Amino acid sequence: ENFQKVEKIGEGTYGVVYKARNKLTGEVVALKKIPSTAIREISLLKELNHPNIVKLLDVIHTENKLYLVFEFLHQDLKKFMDASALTGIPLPLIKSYLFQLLQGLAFCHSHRVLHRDLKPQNLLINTEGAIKLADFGLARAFVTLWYRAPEILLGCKYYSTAVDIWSLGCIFAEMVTRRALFPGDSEIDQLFRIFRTLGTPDEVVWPGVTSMPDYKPSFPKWARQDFSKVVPPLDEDGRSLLSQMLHYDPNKRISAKAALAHPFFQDVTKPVP
Numbered sequence: 001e002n003f004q005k006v007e008k009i010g011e012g013t014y015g016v017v018y019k020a021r022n023k024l025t026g027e028v029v030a031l032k033k034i035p036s037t038a039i040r041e042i043s044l045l046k047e048l049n050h051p052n053i054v055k056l057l058d059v060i061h062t063e064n065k066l067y068l069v070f071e072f073l074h075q076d077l078k079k080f081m082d083a084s085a086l087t088g089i090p091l092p093l094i095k096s097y098l099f100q101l102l103q104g105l106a107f108c109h110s111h112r113v114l115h116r117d118l119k120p121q122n123l124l125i126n127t128e129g130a131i132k133l134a135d136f137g138l139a140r141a142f143v144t145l146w147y148r149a150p151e152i153l154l155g156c157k158y159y160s161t162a163v164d165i166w167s168l169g170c171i172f173a174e175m176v177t178r179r180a181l182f183p184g185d186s187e188i189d190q191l192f193r194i195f196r197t198l199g200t201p202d203e204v205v206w207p208g209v210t211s212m213p214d215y216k217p218s219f220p221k222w223a224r225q226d227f228s229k230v231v232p233p234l235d236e237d238g239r240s241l242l243s244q245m246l247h248y249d250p251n252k253r254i255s256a257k258a259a260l261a262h263p264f265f266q267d268v269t270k271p272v273p
């Protein structure tokens with residue numbers, strides 16, 4: 001009633017998102033039409049503000065529906081990558097975006113909040129050269145496997161903030177190469193695409209891996225490929241960072257804060273797109 005619905009923007013996992021105009025304020029919002037527990041969890045997230053997190057303005061539980069009102073941004077990184085496919089994204093911009101996303105995650109993580117589901121369609125950009133995480137924390141409260149960390153794929157229930165670093169590493173490589181890193185069409189094909197590139201994990205590189213719920217002794221045993229073949233022509237700093245983001249063991253995987261001190265971001269700027 002309070003919002004004139006402008007355009008179906010899309011259709012996430014959680015229901016319809018419309019661009020809509022508040023009538024009592026005139027403001028344009030993204031309006032997402034979606035349990036007592038889910039609504040509390042969602043409301044906690046109104047308190048989670050950072051310039052690289054898309055703002056959740058409101059949560060309206062009414063006529064027993066859930067409406068989430070978010071700040072609106074005109075573009076998403078997926079759509080930006082598709083239109084830069086023949087020229088690519090320049091590296092200072094890739095480097096700026098990665099840095100901002102990492103700031104975003106480091107904030108959220110320091111508050112024990114995870115995203116759990118990062119992907120290019122969740123990363124929104126403005127004309128100012130800001131990139132922001134959208135749908136953050138919505139997974140806990142209430143489809144692409146390509147960004148999914150191996151601990152999740154191997155059936156871990158109690159996964160950590162490292163799952164978001166894994167996802168961001170995947171998106172980073174994709175920005176650079178203009179092709180998804182691990183484009184799996186099932187859970188097992190997803191795991192096996194990761195294994196063909198990074199090697200089948202064992203107790204050497206990942207202590208405890210063999211006792212994970214969906215780990216099978218019968219997994220084919222691939223060797224690790226060189227990262228220079230995976231993300232050419234990213235430089236040595238970039239490759240060093242990327243490999244730390246894609247460590248198998250979630251405990252050895254670089255944290256968002258430690259990644260902000262990496263020499264890849266020595267010379268980081270904020271270019272406009």
Ligand SMILES: c1ccc2[nH]c(-n3ccnc3)nc2c1
Pocket residue numbers: 009010017030054070071072073074075076079124134
């Ligand atoms: C807030 C939340 C989700 C949103 N999704 C978009 N979007 C997707 C494609 N073009 C724009 N803007 C949003 C703003």
